[PDB]
Amino acid sequence: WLPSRSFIAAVIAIGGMQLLATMDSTVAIVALPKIQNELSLSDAGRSWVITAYVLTFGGLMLLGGRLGDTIGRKRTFIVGVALFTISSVLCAVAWDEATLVIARLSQGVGSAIASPTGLALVATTFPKGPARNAATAVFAAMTAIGSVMGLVVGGALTEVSWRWAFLVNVPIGLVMIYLARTALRETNKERMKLDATGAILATLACTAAVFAFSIGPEKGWMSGITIGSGLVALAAAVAFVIVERTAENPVVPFHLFRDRNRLVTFSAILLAGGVMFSLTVCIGLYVQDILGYSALRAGVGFIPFVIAMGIGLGVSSQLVSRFSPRVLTIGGGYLLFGAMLYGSFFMHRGVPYFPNLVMPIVVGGIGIGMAVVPLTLSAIAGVGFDQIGPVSAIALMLQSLGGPLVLAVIQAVITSRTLYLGGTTGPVKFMNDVQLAALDHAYTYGLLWVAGAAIIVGGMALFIGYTPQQVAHAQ
Amino acid sequence: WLPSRSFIAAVIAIGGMQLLATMDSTVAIVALPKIQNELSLSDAGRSWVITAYVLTFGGLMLLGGRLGDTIGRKRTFIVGVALFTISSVLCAVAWDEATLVIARLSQGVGSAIASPTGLALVATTFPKGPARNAATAVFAAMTAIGSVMGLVVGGALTEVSWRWAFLVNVPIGLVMIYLARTALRETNKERMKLDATGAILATLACTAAVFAFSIGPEKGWMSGITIGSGLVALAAAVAFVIVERTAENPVVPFHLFRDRNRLVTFSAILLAGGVMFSLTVCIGLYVQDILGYSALRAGVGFIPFVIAMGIGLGVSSQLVSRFSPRVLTIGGGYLLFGAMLYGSFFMHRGVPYFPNLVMPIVVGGIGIGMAVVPLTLSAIAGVGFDQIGPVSAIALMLQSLGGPLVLAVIQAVITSRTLYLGGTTGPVKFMNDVQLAALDHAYTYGLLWVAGAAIIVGGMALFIGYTPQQVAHAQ
């Protein structure tokens, strides 16, 4: 009951990077048509506004884990959050496309520097036990709050110019910078050297892969640019693995993943992050298009998801010292699957909110909160303090990577169902009522596909052999 | 509220055959070691006691559907139940192995004559609507009551000689004979001829297949007897299909199954009956062996399953006129899967009853009762009165056939897990405590496998395109 102020400040500072990242992503997604309208950007700039951030967020994310070890976890977190804040400041004053792209790239750089550092700090600054469970719950809860708050802020700021939607990341960024500066304590000055070769190779591979994936849609999958980026990404990844095989300080520890528990946990983390991102994007798009809700309405309707997710995360953090990681993930997934089944069966255009939309969201939020804590608690387990950083970076990178992968499949299925039901393709304002029920039925079919994906996640998580003695039982 | 006495008598008379069949099966399974002890039967006679009944129950079941059409549904039901009652009478006075085998064979003949006739009577004697829904609920509920009452009767009669356990089928048989004689009304005397060739071929094929499946275990899968029986069964089935292709009065209508809805419904019926039988056998064996409960204790502990299943069947029969067959089956399966997950995770030797065994049982019973009504309601739908009989016979045969198929896989998995955990094979009394926890963990693993099977059942039932307008909406 009301823990020490230092602990609360520490956990809030650690989760602040996740909050800022998801807040900025949601705000950009909301404000992007306004950005296009004002700056007179084409579809190229429209895609670039998000691609520039995602490129540098995914490319340099594997570097931050070792960066926090070679310079200092608190120092790297401070640097990353300060870079993100300054980048948002310069983004909210952009006057052309190049300035906006540069600002988004630098925001991605800061986020990639600071987020795996926070995931590693969760395990580093708190010994195993209730402290780590509370830190994990705060981490995930503040990720959810960041997403929903970004949606709300974008919806509220839609009327005025979009330049005010990016200045919101400045006060929060400064607040979390101060919190991480005062709350956190620097550990022993046991600085150790970093292998530049592995870091450069991993950064190049991840950046090229992200560039290929993002440029596919717009520039054609069969074009030369995307295939060249994919080829250089694959070559860089192969060379990076080759160097890590004989690396004296592994940026990615390949001997750790020989464990069945760790490998199963990370695979479940990837596919569960994919399911979560697919759910978020699909529910947001459904509420915006079919239900006719504005962005502010969508955010104030998704606030109950944040409440339920916080409840579930607290409950899971309480029972993670009694019940296994396998049991807790399967129980949360069961709740989420029930909510998703109800949403797929009894959701059409014109449904109320209280009974039809709030309940499926609250049950799903409780299930997701119950399933998140054991997963990310098993991710950071049984590793040294000079070696937790890479594990946290890999876990966060897998969680962020799984999202678009499953989302592409779900959106392809939804579009195919829309076209087969007789619904045209394009903005939802052009299509009339006969083409709007087809979109709703396609969205329900996509929810069914997400349900199948969640079943796969649970079948995979059945094999997590971790026991609560080595997750939340200290010494 | 309290419908007409004629309707209640009719539905009870129709479900009486199912009640008698499951009651006799459970009683024989319970009393079989006593039968072996008294009559000094070897393992051959031990297997024969059940094989003789199952052979004639499975062989002649496809014949009863057309038999009720060529002679009369009420007349065939009366004949079948009377044969079953007289056969039980002669079984309870057996003095050697041959008499017991003959009695079991004649009991199987009566059951195969009378049960598909009852399934057809459910759809024939009641027009589409609430009457058929209530008849379906009574059918399934009385099947469950028959099973649990047979377990209870066997447990109570275990102390005295086994000859009193088979006389219990006489008063119930006579009661249901009288109920079907007075309650039911004979329809128009529109008797039509029966093709002897198709009936003989189907009976021979089914009998030979059942003989092969039952003699495999005991006489070796690779022996000549089982392979010969399988070959003659396959040849008879092929010839039967060939004759039905050009049959003037199809015993099995092969043109009906061109429908996607009917084919999906019957496949789901087969696999769901398999899941149900696997659940029943595995839970009974677990309660008997690991928990150390006697047969009477097992029956009085499974009575709550009957109560919950009746509740679920009533609920499903109420909502089958509002919600689709797909939605209702998936909702019942969700409840059953939650109960089965809890049973697989939190069930070990020495668990209490009230909290650990009664709850999962109740939730699973509610789910099964909710899922049964839409399935067997979609089975008997969109067929003429001169043609419903074959459909009912095929549905019941698939439901009874799926059981042992899945049960063999589940038991093989359980035995493999027991041997891999270090548990010996044989009677549970010989193995000590170190070999008793292995059996419990193997049973939990088998429950997980049954959970996967139920997931498959639900994925298959997602495709049932039937709408409540053509299931429970009369004219």
PDB file of N, CA and C in Angstrom, chain B residues 131-195:
ATOM      1  N   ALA B 131     -41.396 -27.643 -29.766  1.00  0.00           N
ATOM      2  CA  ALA B 131     -41.591 -29.049 -29.435  1.00  0.00           C
ATOM      3  C   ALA B 131     -40.343 -29.864 -29.750  1.00  0.00           C
ATOM      4  N   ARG B 132     -39.753 -29.639 -30.927  1.00  0.00           N
ATOM      5  CA  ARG B 132     -38.544 -30.368 -31.294  1.00  0.00           C
ATOM      6  C   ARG B 132     -37.374 -29.985 -30.398  1.00  0.00           C
ATOM      7  N   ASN B 133     -37.289 -28.712 -30.001  1.00  0.00           N
ATOM      8  CA  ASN B 133     -36.225 -28.287 -29.095  1.00  0.00           C
ATOM      9  C   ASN B 133     -36.352 -28.977 -27.742  1.00  0.00           C
ATOM     10  N   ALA B 134     -37.570 -29.032 -27.202  1.00  0.00           N
ATOM     11  CA  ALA B 134     -37.781 -29.718 -25.932  1.00  0.00           C
ATOM     12  C   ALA B 134     -37.490 -31.208 -26.055  1.00  0.00           C
ATOM     13  N   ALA B 135     -37.880 -31.821 -27.175  1.00  0.00           N
ATOM     14  CA  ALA B 135     -37.593 -33.238 -27.378  1.00  0.00           C
ATOM     15  C   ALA B 135     -36.093 -33.496 -27.443  1.00  0.00           C
ATOM     16  N   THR B 136     -35.352 -32.620 -28.123  1.00  0.00           N
ATOM     17  CA  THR B 136     -33.899 -32.747 -28.184  1.00  0.00           C
ATOM     18  C   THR B 136     -33.269 -32.616 -26.802  1.00  0.00           C
ATOM     19  N   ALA B 137     -33.713 -31.622 -26.029  1.00  0.00           N
ATOM     20  CA  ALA B 137     -33.187 -31.447 -24.682  1.00  0.00           C
ATOM     21  C   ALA B 137     -33.469 -32.674 -23.824  1.00  0.00           C
ATOM     22  N   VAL B 138     -34.683 -33.222 -23.922  1.00  0.00           N
ATOM     23  CA  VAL B 138     -35.028 -34.417 -23.159  1.00  0.00           C
ATOM     24  C   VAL B 138     -34.169 -35.598 -23.593  1.00  0.00           C
ATOM     25  N   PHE B 139     -33.972 -35.756 -24.905  1.00  0.00           N
ATOM     26  CA  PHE B 139     -33.118 -36.811 -25.443  1.00  0.00           C
ATOM     27  C   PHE B 139     -31.737 -36.789 -24.798  1.00  0.00           C
ATOM     28  N   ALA B 140     -31.046 -35.653 -24.915  1.00  0.00           N
ATOM     29  CA  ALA B 140     -29.678 -35.581 -24.408  1.00  0.00           C
ATOM     30  C   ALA B 140     -29.636 -35.678 -22.884  1.00  0.00           C
ATOM     31  N   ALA B 141     -30.569 -35.006 -22.203  1.00  0.00           N
ATOM     32  CA  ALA B 141     -30.592 -35.053 -20.750  1.00  0.00           C
ATOM     33  C   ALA B 141     -30.774 -36.476 -20.256  1.00  0.00           C
ATOM     34  N   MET B 142     -31.697 -37.226 -20.859  1.00  0.00           N
ATOM     35  CA  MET B 142     -31.925 -38.596 -20.433  1.00  0.00           C
ATOM     36  C   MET B 142     -30.792 -39.527 -20.830  1.00  0.00           C
ATOM     37  N   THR B 143     -30.050 -39.225 -21.899  1.00  0.00           N
ATOM     38  CA  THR B 143     -28.807 -39.957 -22.137  1.00  0.00           C
ATOM     39  C   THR B 143     -27.843 -39.785 -20.965  1.00  0.00           C
ATOM     40  N   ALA B 144     -27.650 -38.537 -20.528  1.00  0.00           N
ATOM     41  CA  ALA B 144     -26.750 -38.282 -19.403  1.00  0.00           C
ATOM     42  C   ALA B 144     -27.248 -38.948 -18.122  1.00  0.00           C
ATOM     43  N   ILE B 145     -28.555 -38.858 -17.856  1.00  0.00           N
ATOM     44  CA  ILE B 145     -29.120 -39.497 -16.670  1.00  0.00           C
ATOM     45  C   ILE B 145     -28.938 -41.004 -16.738  1.00  0.00           C
ATOM     46  N   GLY B 146     -29.106 -41.594 -17.922  1.00  0.00           N
ATOM     47  CA  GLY B 146     -28.871 -43.019 -18.058  1.00  0.00           C
ATOM     48  C   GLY B 146     -27.451 -43.402 -17.700  1.00  0.00           C
ATOM     49  N   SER B 147     -26.473 -42.647 -18.210  1.00  0.00           N
ATOM     50  CA  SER B 147     -25.076 -42.949 -17.893  1.00  0.00           C
ATOM     51  C   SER B 147     -24.816 -42.861 -16.390  1.00  0.00           C
ATOM     52  N   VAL B 148     -25.198 -41.739 -15.776  1.00  0.00           N
ATOM     53  CA  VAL B 148     -24.882 -41.534 -14.364  1.00  0.00           C
ATOM     54  C   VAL B 148     -25.651 -42.517 -13.485  1.00  0.00           C
ATOM     55  N   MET B 149     -26.912 -42.791 -13.826  1.00  0.00           N
ATOM     56  CA  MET B 149     -27.706 -43.750 -13.071  1.00  0.00           C
ATOM     57  C   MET B 149     -27.150 -45.159 -13.198  1.00  0.00           C
ATOM     58  N   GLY B 150     -26.627 -45.527 -14.369  1.00  0.00           N
ATOM     59  CA  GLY B 150     -25.971 -46.815 -14.489  1.00  0.00           C
ATOM     60  C   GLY B 150     -24.742 -46.916 -13.612  1.00  0.00           C
ATOM     61  N   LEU B 151     -23.938 -45.850 -13.575  1.00  0.00           N
ATOM     62  CA  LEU B 151     -22.779 -45.841 -12.685  1.00  0.00           C
ATOM     63  C   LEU B 151     -23.209 -45.998 -11.227  1.00  0.00           C
ATOM     64  N   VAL B 152     -24.238 -45.251 -10.818  1.00  0.00           N
ATOM     65  CA  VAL B 152     -24.712 -45.304  -9.436  1.00  0.00           C
ATOM     66  C   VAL B 152     -25.243 -46.691  -9.100  1.00  0.00           C
ATOM     67  N   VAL B 153     -26.023 -47.279 -10.008  1.00  0.00           N
ATOM     68  CA  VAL B 153     -26.615 -48.589  -9.761  1.00  0.00           C
ATOM     69  C   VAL B 153     -25.533 -49.655  -9.662  1.00  0.00           C
ATOM     70  N   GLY B 154     -24.542 -49.613 -10.556  1.00  0.00           N
ATOM     71  CA  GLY B 154     -23.440 -50.554 -10.456  1.00  0.00           C
ATOM     72  C   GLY B 154     -22.680 -50.421  -9.151  1.00  0.00           C
ATOM     73  N   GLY B 155     -22.390 -49.182  -8.743  1.00  0.00           N
ATOM     74  CA  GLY B 155     -21.693 -48.979  -7.483  1.00  0.00           C
ATOM     75  C   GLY B 155     -22.484 -49.474  -6.287  1.00  0.00           C
ATOM     76  N   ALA B 156     -23.798 -49.239  -6.291  1.00  0.00           N
ATOM     77  CA  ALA B 156     -24.627 -49.677  -5.173  1.00  0.00           C
ATOM     78  C   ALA B 156     -24.768 -51.193  -5.149  1.00  0.00           C
ATOM     79  N   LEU B 157     -24.839 -51.823  -6.317  1.00  0.00           N
ATOM     80  CA  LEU B 157     -25.059 -53.257  -6.420  1.00  0.00           C
ATOM     81  C   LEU B 157     -23.760 -54.051  -6.438  1.00  0.00           C
ATOM     82  N   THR B 158     -22.610 -53.380  -6.311  1.00  0.00           N
ATOM     83  CA  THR B 158     -21.326 -54.073  -6.350  1.00  0.00           C
ATOM     84  C   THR B 158     -21.197 -55.117  -5.243  1.00  0.00           C
ATOM     85  N   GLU B 159     -21.723 -54.831  -4.049  1.00  0.00           N
ATOM     86  CA  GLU B 159     -21.541 -55.746  -2.923  1.00  0.00           C
ATOM     87  C   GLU B 159     -22.207 -57.092  -3.186  1.00  0.00           C
ATOM     88  N   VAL B 160     -23.458 -57.075  -3.639  1.00  0.00           N
ATOM     89  CA  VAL B 160     -24.193 -58.301  -3.930  1.00  0.00           C
ATOM     90  C   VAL B 160     -23.798 -58.804  -5.311  1.00  0.00           C
ATOM     91  N   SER B 161     -24.264 -60.001  -5.665  1.00  0.00           N
ATOM     92  CA  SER B 161     -23.920 -60.609  -6.944  1.00  0.00           C
ATOM     93  C   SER B 161     -24.285 -59.696  -8.110  1.00  0.00           C
ATOM     94  N   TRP B 162     -23.553 -59.862  -9.215  1.00  0.00           N
ATOM     95  CA  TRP B 162     -23.747 -59.021 -10.392  1.00  0.00           C
ATOM     96  C   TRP B 162     -25.049 -59.323 -11.119  1.00  0.00           C
ATOM     97  N   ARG B 163     -25.683 -60.459 -10.828  1.00  0.00           N
ATOM     98  CA  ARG B 163     -26.915 -60.824 -11.517  1.00  0.00           C
ATOM     99  C   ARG B 163     -28.051 -59.855 -11.223  1.00  0.00           C
ATOM    100  N   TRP B 164     -27.966 -59.104 -10.125  1.00  0.00           N
ATOM    101  CA  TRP B 164     -28.978 -58.104  -9.812  1.00  0.00           C
ATOM    102  C   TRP B 164     -28.743 -56.783 -10.529  1.00  0.00           C
ATOM    103  N   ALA B 165     -27.561 -56.581 -11.114  1.00  0.00           N
ATOM    104  CA  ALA B 165     -27.269 -55.338 -11.817  1.00  0.00           C
ATOM    105  C   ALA B 165     -27.884 -55.288 -13.208  1.00  0.00           C
ATOM    106  N   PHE B 166     -28.223 -56.439 -13.789  1.00  0.00           N
ATOM    107  CA  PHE B 166     -28.847 -56.471 -15.104  1.00  0.00           C
ATOM    108  C   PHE B 166     -30.367 -56.509 -15.039  1.00  0.00           C
ATOM    109  N   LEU B 167     -30.942 -56.889 -13.897  1.00  0.00           N
ATOM    110  CA  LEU B 167     -32.390 -56.846 -13.733  1.00  0.00           C
ATOM    111  C   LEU B 167     -32.925 -55.429 -13.592  1.00  0.00           C
ATOM    112  N   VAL B 168     -32.052 -54.432 -13.417  1.00  0.00           N
ATOM    113  CA  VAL B 168     -32.511 -53.055 -13.312  1.00  0.00           C
ATOM    114  C   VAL B 168     -33.046 -52.540 -14.640  1.00  0.00           C
ATOM    115  N   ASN B 169     -32.610 -53.123 -15.759  1.00  0.00           N
ATOM    116  CA  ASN B 169     -33.067 -52.669 -17.067  1.00  0.00           C
ATOM    117  C   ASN B 169     -34.468 -53.166 -17.400  1.00  0.00           C
ATOM    118  N   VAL B 170     -35.026 -54.065 -16.595  1.00  0.00           N
ATOM    119  CA  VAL B 170     -36.343 -54.639 -16.864  1.00  0.00           C
ATOM    120  C   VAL B 170     -37.455 -53.667 -16.477  1.00  0.00           C
ATOM    121  N   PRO B 171     -37.502 -53.137 -15.243  1.00  0.00           N
ATOM    122  CA  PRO B 171     -38.594 -52.203 -14.922  1.00  0.00           C
ATOM    123  C   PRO B 171     -38.564 -50.945 -15.767  1.00  0.00           C
ATOM    124  N   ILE B 172     -37.377 -50.378 -15.993  1.00  0.00           N
ATOM    125  CA  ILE B 172     -37.270 -49.190 -16.836  1.00  0.00           C
ATOM    126  C   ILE B 172     -37.689 -49.515 -18.262  1.00  0.00           C
ATOM    127  N   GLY B 173     -37.263 -50.673 -18.770  1.00  0.00           N
ATOM    128  CA  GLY B 173     -37.648 -51.061 -20.117  1.00  0.00           C
ATOM    129  C   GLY B 173     -39.149 -51.196 -20.272  1.00  0.00           C
ATOM    130  N   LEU B 174     -39.800 -51.848 -19.305  1.00  0.00           N
ATOM    131  CA  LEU B 174     -41.251 -51.989 -19.359  1.00  0.00           C
ATOM    132  C   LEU B 174     -41.944 -50.636 -19.246  1.00  0.00           C
ATOM    133  N   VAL B 175     -41.428 -49.756 -18.383  1.00  0.00           N
ATOM    134  CA  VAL B 175     -42.024 -48.434 -18.217  1.00  0.00           C
ATOM    135  C   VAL B 175     -41.975 -47.663 -19.529  1.00  0.00           C
ATOM    136  N   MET B 176     -40.820 -47.673 -20.197  1.00  0.00           N
ATOM    137  CA  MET B 176     -40.716 -46.930 -21.449  1.00  0.00           C
ATOM    138  C   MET B 176     -41.478 -47.611 -22.579  1.00  0.00           C
ATOM    139  N   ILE B 177     -41.609 -48.940 -22.543  1.00  0.00           N
ATOM    140  CA  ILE B 177     -42.463 -49.625 -23.513  1.00  0.00           C
ATOM    141  C   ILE B 177     -43.900 -49.141 -23.379  1.00  0.00           C
ATOM    142  N   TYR B 178     -44.405 -49.099 -22.143  1.00  0.00           N
ATOM    143  CA  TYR B 178     -45.767 -48.625 -21.917  1.00  0.00           C
ATOM    144  C   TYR B 178     -45.916 -47.164 -22.324  1.00  0.00           C
ATOM    145  N   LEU B 179     -44.921 -46.337 -21.996  1.00  0.00           N
ATOM    146  CA  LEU B 179     -44.991 -44.920 -22.338  1.00  0.00           C
ATOM    147  C   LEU B 179     -45.031 -44.719 -23.846  1.00  0.00           C
ATOM    148  N   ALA B 180     -44.212 -45.464 -24.590  1.00  0.00           N
ATOM    149  CA  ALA B 180     -44.229 -45.350 -26.042  1.00  0.00           C
ATOM    150  C   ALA B 180     -45.479 -45.964 -26.655  1.00  0.00           C
ATOM    151  N   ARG B 181     -46.096 -46.941 -25.986  1.00  0.00           N
ATOM    152  CA  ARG B 181     -47.323 -47.526 -26.512  1.00  0.00           C
ATOM    153  C   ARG B 181     -48.505 -46.576 -26.358  1.00  0.00           C
ATOM    154  N   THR B 182     -48.643 -45.947 -25.191  1.00  0.00           N
ATOM    155  CA  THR B 182     -49.798 -45.078 -24.971  1.00  0.00           C
ATOM    156  C   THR B 182     -49.582 -43.653 -25.465  1.00  0.00           C
ATOM    157  N   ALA B 183     -48.419 -43.059 -25.197  1.00  0.00           N
ATOM    158  CA  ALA B 183     -48.196 -41.665 -25.566  1.00  0.00           C
ATOM    159  C   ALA B 183     -48.148 -41.489 -27.079  1.00  0.00           C
ATOM    160  N   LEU B 184     -47.360 -42.311 -27.762  1.00  0.00           N
ATOM    161  CA  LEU B 184     -47.171 -42.141 -29.193  1.00  0.00           C
ATOM    162  C   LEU B 184     -48.411 -42.576 -29.970  1.00  0.00           C
ATOM    163  N   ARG B 185     -48.648 -41.896 -31.088  1.00  0.00           N
ATOM    164  CA  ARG B 185     -49.705 -42.242 -32.028  1.00  0.00           C
ATOM    165  C   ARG B 185     -49.086 -42.751 -33.319  1.00  0.00           C
ATOM    166  N   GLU B 186     -49.653 -43.826 -33.860  1.00  0.00           N
ATOM    167  CA  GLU B 186     -49.210 -44.333 -35.148  1.00  0.00           C
ATOM    168  C   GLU B 186     -49.615 -43.369 -36.256  1.00  0.00           C
ATOM    169  N   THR B 187     -48.683 -43.102 -37.164  1.00  0.00           N
ATOM    170  CA  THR B 187     -48.933 -42.191 -38.273  1.00  0.00           C
ATOM    171  C   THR B 187     -49.772 -42.904 -39.333  1.00  0.00           C
ATOM    172  N   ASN B 188     -49.921 -42.273 -40.496  1.00  0.00           N
ATOM    173  CA  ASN B 188     -50.653 -42.893 -41.590  1.00  0.00           C
ATOM    174  C   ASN B 188     -49.959 -44.175 -42.028  1.00  0.00           C
ATOM    175  N   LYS B 189     -50.759 -45.177 -42.392  1.00  0.00           N
ATOM    176  CA  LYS B 189     -50.236 -46.489 -42.776  1.00  0.00           C
ATOM    177  C   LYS B 189     -49.646 -46.438 -44.188  1.00  0.00           C
ATOM    178  N   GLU B 190     -48.640 -45.581 -44.343  1.00  0.00           N
ATOM    179  CA  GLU B 190     -47.943 -45.424 -45.617  1.00  0.00           C
ATOM    180  C   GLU B 190     -46.673 -46.274 -45.606  1.00  0.00           C
ATOM    181  N   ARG B 191     -46.885 -47.583 -45.505  1.00  0.00           N
ATOM    182  CA  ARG B 191     -45.770 -48.519 -45.506  1.00  0.00           C
ATOM    183  C   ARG B 191     -45.178 -48.627 -46.904  1.00  0.00           C
ATOM    184  N   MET B 192     -43.852 -48.645 -46.974  1.00  0.00           N
ATOM    185  CA  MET B 192     -43.141 -48.716 -48.241  1.00  0.00           C
ATOM    186  C   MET B 192     -41.992 -49.709 -48.136  1.00  0.00           C
ATOM    187  N   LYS B 193     -41.663 -50.317 -49.274  1.00  0.00           N
ATOM    188  CA  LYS B 193     -40.795 -51.486 -49.303  1.00  0.00           C
ATOM    189  C   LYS B 193     -39.363 -51.137 -48.920  1.00  0.00           C
ATOM    190  N   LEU B 194     -38.645 -52.137 -48.419  1.00  0.00           N
ATOM    191  CA  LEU B 194     -37.256 -52.001 -48.013  1.00  0.00           C
ATOM    192  C   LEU B 194     -36.354 -52.820 -48.929  1.00  0.00           C
ATOM    193  N   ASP B 195     -35.234 -52.220 -49.325  1.00  0.00           N
ATOM    194  CA  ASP B 195     -34.235 -52.910 -50.130  1.00  0.00           C
ATOM    195  C   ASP B 195     -33.389 -53.791 -49.216  1.00  0.00           C
TER     196      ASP B 195
END
